[PDB]
């Protein structure tokens, strides 16, 4: 079906029409909108060993650390020692089914610290003194991308949203909501370390197949890159008169910028170039600031126009992950006690199909139009609009 643009209007006395339902419903509690509780994880803290005991026969350390994490979950320990207790498993395990449960060991253990911080059980300065640690940055930047591909990548590919997975929009997920503190509290004090951890995170993301390619990545997986990256982050005049190993970086970034500005070429490498250049721009502002080329190519607004579609498609995929569940929510994400049955809900007819029209109207309101952009913005958005209007009744 070739559904046209759902022309609507989100004005005063209409934002609270639906967000009020979103202010209390099961989804959107850990999310937000672009128009602008501990028992849930505790039940998984009980379900932590649903199947570990089934195949203990090698497979004993999984249950050995399982009950240890269960003990550490509910027991109250001073912050000066809780980190030492929890790091015993973190610094011990090195690395198919094994890792399928090893990640759940690491992922659930780290969620405790943020939960205690939300309850003011852990001092903020104590958290600061441990987040600056080098190894834990590598632990988190690895476990996030591993956990996402554990559950959401299986269903993302089928919908066709796999090609539009962006690393910098991962905190917006309801499950990965605790990262907001790890981001803002870290950037407020040590802002450089935020770009540092993002630079690492995209680096592991590239080589795990999130943004795969047959050619090497000349921007990541090398400490010497960050040397110049941080050198220009302080002196605002080291790029106008650059040293060597920096003309090379400019030559590899402007080439990708021209690739992005190109029209006919294959699209997957535009996707790869986008997921690189947006990361470098958001973490290292003023690194592709070609003051002459961008103005006569409308690059500054083109990047934002092609960026907004990613969040739009993420929200559409979230709605799809909600409709059929009423497991696409992901393994170890929703406990069976709080599971969602199959029955249709009356509140969906007033807050879901209407909200889709609001979302598409908000998508079709300030995005510029260009034939190159249309292949990047108009075509995928129209495909999503066609797909979203063929499944709501069923």
């Amino acid at each position: 079906v070739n559904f046209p643009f759902p022309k609507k209007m989100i004005t005063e006395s209409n934002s609270k029409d639906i967000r009020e339902y979103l202010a209390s419903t099961f989804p959107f509690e850990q999310q937000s909108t672009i128009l602008d509780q501990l028992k849930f994880r505790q039940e998984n803290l009980a379900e932590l060993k649903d199947q570990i005991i089934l195949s203990l026969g090698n497979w004993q350390k999984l249950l050995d650390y399982t009950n240890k994490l269960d003990e550490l979950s509910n027991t109250k320990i001073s912050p000066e020692e809780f980190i030492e207790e929890i790091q015993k498993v973190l610094y011990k395990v090195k690395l198919k089914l094994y890792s399928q449960f090893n990640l759940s060991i690491q992922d659930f253990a780290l969620q405790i610290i943020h939960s205690k911080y939300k309850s003011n059980q852990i001092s903020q300065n104590d958290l600061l003194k441990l987040i600056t640690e080098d190894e834990m940055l590598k632990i988190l930047a690895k476990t996030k991308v591993l956990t996402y591909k554990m559950k959401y990548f299986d269903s993302a590919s089928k919908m066709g949203i796999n090609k539009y997975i962006s690393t910098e929009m991962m905190d917006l997920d309801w499950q990965f909501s605790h990262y907001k503190t790890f981001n803002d509290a870290l950037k407020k004090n040590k802002a450089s370390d935020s770009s540092y951890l993002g630079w690492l995170t995209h680096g592991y993301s590239i080589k795990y197949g999130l943004s795969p390619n047959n050619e090497r990545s000349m921007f990541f997986q090398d400490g010497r890159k960050y040397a110049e990256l941080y050198a220009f982050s302080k002196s605002p005049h080291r790029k106008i008169i650059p040293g060597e190993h920096l003309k090379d970086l400019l030559a590899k970034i402007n080439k990708s910028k021209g690739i992005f500005l190109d029209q006919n070429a294959l699209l997957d490498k535009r996707i790869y170039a986008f997921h690189e250049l947006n990361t470098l721009e958001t973490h290292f502002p003023g690194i592709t600031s070609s003051f002459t080329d961008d103005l006569k190519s409308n690059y500054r607004k083109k990047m934002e126009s092609v960026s907004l579609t990613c969040q739009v498609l993420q929200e559409i995929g979230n709605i799809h992950r909600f409709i059929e569940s009423k497991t696409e929510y992901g393994l170890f994400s929703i406990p069976k006690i709080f599971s969602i049955p199959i029955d249709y809900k009356h509140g969906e007819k007033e807050n879901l199909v209407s909200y889709v029209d609001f979302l598409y109207s908000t998508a079709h309101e300030r995005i510029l139009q260009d034939n190159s952009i249309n292949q990047l913005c108009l075509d995928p958005l129209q495909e999503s609009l066609n797909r979203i209007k063929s499944n709501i009744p069923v």
Binding site: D134, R224, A227, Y230, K234, P236, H237, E244
Partner: protein, 838 residues
């Protein structure tokens, strides 16, 4: 027994070689016009024989079944040498009355050209006038020289004559005198004498006194006068010093001008870099005006359809006011012979076949002058430049390693690294004004080199008449009429004729940015191969090398190589091994078996097997990965006391074993540069009690998140006085650290990072240069990060040469009086922007 006869023939063979390079060196000196055809053909054949016996001796050397093959080969080669002897001897004649007159100078009538013809010569003639006549006022300043260095025919005698014509009536004497490649000193001095007075010294060319009495005469004639002599085209400065003594008396108000094609002889004059006058190619607009002056009538917009051809061709000349004259005169026989077709034919022809034309060879002699003036052991170095494509930068390190691997560098003094010898060859090529250098790499020296376009095709032709190289280009699409005798092949964009049937003796082969490799070409069929170059390819199949024995150079930069075979130990002879940009992440154990090597451009991602100290001959190592390593292997690094340049990054051994390696470093004394990379930590490697190697120049530090506590004590003007590069970062800062650093002799490059300012709540203080006056005799590049360097460290007489400066400036000091600038310092200290902090 049997081997004894072969080995006793080998020395006879090598003597035969030495004789043949003797005679070939003798013949190649003369230009290829005075040579008769018999001698040319004989030389052509003896060169091929030279290749054959070099092949035989190399094969015998690498091997020791084979004895009988070597025997047959040497016997037959002796047979062709013996035959060719009387083939030459059969046809000789004397012809006593063959005295053809010597050729005139090709660039003489060029001196006789119209004054109202040259364009753009202005605003350079005036500048060269007032860079020396500014002292003509108060005409009592001591005499000085101003040399002019250039290349090709960019125009040096022209401007010398121009300055030699305007400011003359204010002088008593003067002489414009030329010098050839092999001058006669008495001839030159007679030339000077006749140029001073033609009356008393009318028939001065007749008398033959001696080299000395006429020198006394010219010295006597130069009393109480200002001469202003100019001498041009002087080569091999040993000539210059003889004339120099003729100017040895005090003479206020005089001076002289010199031109030459070698900068390595101009610095022998004028005792200062301020008096050297570099000359540069003309600008695009002036070149366009000159180009349209000749061909077109008075205006250039008439075609409006070959314009793009015009600027496309004109950039090939670059700025040389010789090519833009030659092509302008060639292309218009009488008013645009035809349109856009011969222009395309000409554009295609350049690079491979443009030189062979009419009224053009009168210009190529002026360029082959430089090639002929080269000594031996340097002609192959220049002719090696034809391999690489037309417009591509060439890293000097690649050239040096290729030369050494080929075998063009050797000596018998045992005091030479055999690598700085290659650097010497490269610098000799550069100072002859015949290669353009660019950049300054991590070695502290030039990054890469570029070759002029028409010079490139000219040397291509010179290498083409023999079989020095072979090029496969689609505008050329030519193959020599003998597939057998091909040694060097430089494959390029052409991907059609990749036939490999008949090159058994294949010296070297290279591919440039082509996907045709592998799917069409086979390398394993080359029984012998000196160097292999495959950088930029997209093939990972290099596992047939075990079938090959004679490789020296092995370049695999950016090749998508996943793995390399375990059978690489068979390559006992090898000099270089570059693996940067490859997918392989662990080297095979069969590198202990290797014996000879000097450079290993490896990436820290890969794993180095234990037993590295065996490679005693190793001379430079790059980007070594030091993580999870046992202490014995760490100490193995101090075993090899020959390494010069080492690059280290690491994440996983910050223990006392760091100090174990720290003193292990001092076991070596051949160092010249070093650098250490580590992430956001205090430097737990270097102690304050550790003697450094005596020779150190660079000592960089790429990391900026890590820091030292303070300035190390072992840095002192006492030890390591050879530094020309600093690159330090540390936590704190002291106003005495700068004072200490100001005592070191050179310190050309300075870059200091203050960690606490850009990472902790600290205010940029103002360090004070307390002791001394200058502390910086020569510091062109100085960088201060997070440290306040006001312009008033000292009056202008502190840093004579300083082009660049960087420091941080608080906004609170705006109302202060410690920023008291406004004067112009001695160096070009007028281009600066300061990072200001609120």
């Amino acid at each position: 027994t049997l081997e004894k006869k072969v080995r006793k023939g080998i020395e006879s063979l090598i003597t035969e070689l030495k004789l043949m390079q003797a005679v070939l060196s003798k013949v190649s000196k003369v230009p290829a016009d005075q040579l008769d055809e018999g001698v040319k053909i004989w030389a052509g054949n003896v060169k091929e024989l030279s290749y054959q016996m070099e092949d035989i001796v190399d094969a015998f050397m690498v091997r020791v079944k084979d004895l009988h093959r070597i025997s047959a080969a040497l016997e037959e080669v002796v047979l062709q040498a013996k035959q060719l002897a009387e083939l030459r001897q059969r046809y000789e004649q004397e012809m006593r009355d063959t005295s053809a007159n010597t050729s005139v100078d090709p660039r003489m009538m060029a001196l006789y050209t119209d004054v109202t013809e040259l364009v753009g010569i202005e605003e350079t003639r005036d500048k060269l006038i007032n860079m020396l006549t500014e002292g003509d006022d108060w005409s009592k300043h001591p005499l000085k020289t101003i040399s002019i260095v250039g290349f090709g025919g960019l125009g040096k005698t022209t401007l010398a004559k121009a300055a030699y014509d305007k400011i003359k009536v204010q002088f008593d004497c003067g002489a414009f005198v030329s010098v050839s490649r092999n001058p006669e000193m008495k001839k030159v001095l007679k030339d000077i004498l006749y140029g001073l007075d033609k009356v008393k010294y009318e028939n001065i060319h007749n008398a033959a006194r001696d080299e000395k009495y006429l020198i006394d005469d010219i010295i006597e004639f130069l009393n109480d006068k200002r001469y202003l002599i100019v001498i041009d085209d002087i080569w091999n400065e040993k000539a210059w010093e003889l004339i120099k003594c003729a100017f040895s008396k005090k003479s206020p108000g005089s001076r002289l001008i010199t031109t030459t094609r070698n900068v390595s002889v101009s610095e022998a004059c004028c005792s200062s870099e301020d008096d050297i006058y570099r000359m540069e190619p003309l600008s695009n607009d002036v070149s366009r005006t000159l180009f349209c002056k000749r061909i077109f009538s008075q205006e250039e917009g008439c075609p409006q359809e070959l314009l793009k051809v015009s600027e496309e061709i004109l950039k090939k000349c670059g700025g040389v006011p010789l090519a833009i004259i030659t092509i302008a005169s060639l292309l218009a026989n009488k008013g645009h012979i035809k349109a856009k077709d011969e222009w395309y034919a000409l554009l295609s022809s350049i690079g491979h076949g443009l030189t062979k034309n009419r009224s053009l060879e009168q210009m190529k002699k002026i360029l082959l002058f430089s090639y002929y003036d080269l000594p031996s052991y340097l002609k192959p170095c220049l002719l090696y430049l034809s391999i690489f494509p037309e417009d591509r930068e060439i890293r000097r390190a690649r050239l040096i390693w290729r030369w050494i691997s080929e075998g063009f560098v050797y000596s018998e003094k045992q005091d030479i690294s055999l690598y700085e010898l290659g650097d010497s060859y490269f610098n000799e090529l550069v100072n002859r004004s015949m290669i353009q250098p660019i950049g300054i790499d991590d070695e502290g020296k030039v990054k890469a080199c570029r070759v002029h376009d028409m010079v490139l095709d000219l040397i291509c032709s010179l290498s083409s008449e023999e079989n020095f190289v072979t090029i496969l280009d689609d505008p050329r699409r030519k193959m020599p009429n003998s597939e057998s005798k091909v040694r060097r092949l430089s494959i390029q964009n052409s991907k059609i004729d990749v036939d490999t049937t008949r090159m058994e003796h294949m010296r070297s082969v290279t591919v440039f940015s082509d996907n045709v490799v592998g799917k069409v070409l086979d390398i394993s069929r080359f029984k012998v191969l000196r160097v292999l170059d495959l950088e930029g390819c997209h093939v990972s199949d290099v596992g047939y090398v075990g079938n090959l024995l004679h490789l020296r150079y092995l370049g695999l930069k950016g090749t998508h190589v996943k793995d390399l075979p375990m059978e690489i130990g068979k390559l006992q002879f090898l000099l270089t091994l570059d693996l940067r940009g490859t997918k392989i992440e662990v080297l095979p154990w069969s590198v202990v078996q290797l014996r000879r090597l000097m450079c290993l451009y490896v990436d820290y991602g890969m794993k180095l097997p234990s037993g590295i100290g065996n490679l005693t001959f190793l001379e430079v190592l790059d980007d070594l990965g030091l993580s999870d390593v046992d202490l014995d292997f760490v100490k193995e690094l101090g075993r090899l006391t020959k390494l010069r340049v080492l690059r280290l990054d690491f994440h996983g051994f910050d223990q006392s074993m760091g100090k174990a390696l720290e003193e292990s470093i001092s076991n070596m004394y051949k160092l010249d540069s070093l650098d250490v990379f580590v992430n956001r930590g205090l430097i737990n490697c270097l102690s304050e009690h550790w003697v450094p190697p005596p020779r150190l120049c660079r000592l960089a530090f790429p990391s900026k998140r890590s820091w030292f506590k303070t300035l190390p004590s072992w840095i002192n003007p006492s030890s390591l006085p050879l530094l020309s590069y600093l690159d330090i970062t540390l936590f704190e800062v002291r106003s005495e650290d700068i004072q200490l650093l100001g005592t070191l002799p050179a310190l050309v490059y300075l870059e200091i990072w203050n960690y606490s300012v850009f990472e902790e709540a600290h205010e940029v203080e103002a360090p004070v240069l307390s002791s001394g006056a200058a502390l910086f005799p020569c510091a062109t590049e100085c960088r201060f990060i997070g440290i306040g360097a006001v312009p008033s460290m000292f009056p202008q007489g502190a840093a004579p040469r300083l082009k660049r400066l960087w420091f941080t400036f608080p906004a609170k000091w705006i109302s202060s009086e410690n920023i008291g600038l406004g004067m112009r310092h001695l160096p070009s200290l007028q281009r600066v922007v300061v990072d200001v902090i609120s």
